[PDB]
């Protein structure tokens, strides 16, 4: 009942964003809340956020 | 109120520098340091790569014959390439290389207004001497982080993420400074970690200029 079959492969590149589920290894799952700017994150004495 | 003046731009490395401010009243050191750190990590002019075209490939999920690394990995390597254009806000860079051996950023054909801070940066590896690679690298001036999705034509062009930010680590300390006899004078030293594209003193000057421009919003001119 079909002459030709055409298969088209799309390749979408996902990115992390609020609402995504991220989890550790010791059963402490969680959902991303806010993508904080780099300067707003807490930083130690050397300045690494 | 004593006016802070910039006294030292001492550099311990090509990518690491410390800028010190000798005179400061009490309480002003932390305020100035925090404002400068936020305004430096937030908004600085950069010259990151935006576009890349390779003759052989069509989409960045393919693999070029004779190239050790995947095309996506090549694009990711190019994303970290640090370059400064001192004359233009737009340039087209052409990379041509043949034969067995790693393809470093030093192999990019260079113009007078375009220089590479670290030529040792590697882009891809050529495993077969018959194989050859060719690129057209497009470099733009911007600030902040602009994802490749929010651009607003040909199949060949490959889009990379753009992150124009010379600075990547800013830290400051407030220390007591001895000026004449009066105490409470503070010295603020700011430790910077750039990719080499932006000078430290020029970065501080630009950041303070932006801060002063933004202060005029709720105050009359002074």
From Swiss-Prot, chain B:
Region called Alpha N-terminal domain (alpha-NTD), residue ranges: 1-221
Record-level GO cellular component terms: cytoplasm; DNA-directed RNA polymerase complex
This enzyme's EC code(s): 2.7.7.6
One Gene Ontology term of the molecular function aspect: DNA binding
Catalyzed chemical reaction(s): RNA(n) + a ribonucleoside 5'-triphosphate = RNA(n+1) + diphosphate
Record key words, sorted: DNA-directed RNA polymerase, Nucleotidyltransferase, Transcription, Transferase
Protein's UniProt keywords contain Nucleotidyltransferase: yes
Top-level EC class as recorded in UniProt: transferase
Biological process according to GO: DNA-templated transcription
Function: DNA-dependent RNA polymerase catalyzes the transcription of DNA into RNA using the four ribonucleoside triphosphates as substrates.
Recorded domain comment: The N-terminal domain is essential for RNAP assembly and basal transcription, whereas the C-terminal domain is involved in interaction with transcriptional regulators and with upstream promoter elements.
Family: Belongs to the RNA polymerase alpha chain family.
Oligomeric form and interacting partners: Homodimer. The RNAP catalytic core consists of 2 alpha, 1 beta, 1 beta' and 1 omega subunit. When a sigma factor is associated with the core the holoenzyme is formed, which can initiate transcription.
Protein name as annotated: DNA-directed RNA polymerase subunit alpha
Top-level taxonomy: Bacteria, Pseudomonadati, Pseudomonadota, Gammaproteobacteria, Enterobacterales
Part of the full-length chain shown: 8 to 234 of 329
């Amino acid at each position: 009942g079909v002459l030709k079959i055409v298969k088209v492969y799309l390749a979408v590149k996902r990115r992390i964003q609020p609402g995504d589920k991220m989890a550790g290894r010791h059963g402490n799952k969680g959902v991303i809340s806010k993508i904080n700017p780099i300067e707003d994150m807490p930083y130690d004495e050397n300045g690494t956020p | 109120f004593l006016k802070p003046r910039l006294v030292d731009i001492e550099q311990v490395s090509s990518t690491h520098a410390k800028v010190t401010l000798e005179p400061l009243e009490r309480g002003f050191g932390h305020t100035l340091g925090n404002a400068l750190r936020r305004i430096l990590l937030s908004s600085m002019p950069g010259c990151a790569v935006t576009e890349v075209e390779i003759d052989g490939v069509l989409h960045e999920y393919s693999t070029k014959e004779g190239v050790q690394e995947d095309i996506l990995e090549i694009l990711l390597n190019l994303k970290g390439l640090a370059v400064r254009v001192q004359g233009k806000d737009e340039v087209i860079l052409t990379l041509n290389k043949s034969g067995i051996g790693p393809v470093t950023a030093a192999d990019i054909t260079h113009d007078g207004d375009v220089e590479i801070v670290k030529p040792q940066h590697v882009i891809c590896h050529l495993t077969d001497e018959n194989a050859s690679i060719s690129m057209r690298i497009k470099v733009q001036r911007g600030r902040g982080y602009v994802p490749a999705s929010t651009r607003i034509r040909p199949i060949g062009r490959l889009l990379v993420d753009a992150c124009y930010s010379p600075v990547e680590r800013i830290a400051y300390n407030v220390e007591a400074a001895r000026v004449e006899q009066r105490t409470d004078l503070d010295k603020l030293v700011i430790e910077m970690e750039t990719n080499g594209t932006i000078d430290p003193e020029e970065a501080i000057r630009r950041a303070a200029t932006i801060l002063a421009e933004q202060l005029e919003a709720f105050v009359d001119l002074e």
